[PDB]
């Protein structure tokens, strides 16, 4: 399940520039997904960290 969502997040950049602007957007998209899964109780840990 987690892979399906993450894959969709990175496929948006197939022919985009490979630079700092992309790397930041990719990371932010993935972390927001994982934070929500944590909030719902899927993942262990006191804080997302």
């Amino acid at each position: 399940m987690a892979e399906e969502s993450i894959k969709k997040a990175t496929e948006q950049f197939v022919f985009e520039p490979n630079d700092g602007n992309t790397w930041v957007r990719v990371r932010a998209m993935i972390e927001n997904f994982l934070i929500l899964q944590w909030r719902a109780g899927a993942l262990a840990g006191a804080k997302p960290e």
Binding site: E3, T10, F15, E16, P17
Partner: protein, 197 residues
Amino acid sequence: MIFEVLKILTDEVNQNFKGLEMEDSEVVLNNVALIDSQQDVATELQNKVILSMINLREEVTMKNFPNNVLEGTKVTYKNPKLNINLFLIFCANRTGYKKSLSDLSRILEFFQHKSVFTQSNTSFDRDLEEMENVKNFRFTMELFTPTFEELNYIWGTLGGRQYPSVFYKLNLIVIDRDATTSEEGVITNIHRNYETL
């Protein structure tokens, strides 16, 4: 592109005086502050209308726009373009005071009818050698009327003795060197690694 836009604008006003069969009125590009300087420039200014540039500003709404180009599987990086507004004056300096008030009405009448100027609109000579760098342009003219406090600021930097005058505001001269800083290839392979933490 500052000189070439103002040289084009000078020709359009001089063409309008020709169609009205007025053979005494001509507009000249020089600076107003040297009208009574009495050093070698004032003899060109006598019995003429003078167009000058008094201020420069920068357009803020377009400042953070990017300028990269994508083609194939390759990207070229460039710096963002600079956009500039101008503030202009038409200063009448005829021998007769009655003749200066007649020329100011004609300039006000001309911009009331035509306010947009493009590369297809204008009648300047394209073959001239000083105009070999101009390709595509579009600018508008808009009348500007200042208060009494603002007139004191403007004529305070031009001598302190006013003349019959009108003020205009010009929009969007584009300044851009269009040089390349870098070239790179786009993303074509994606790898993902997962671990149990």
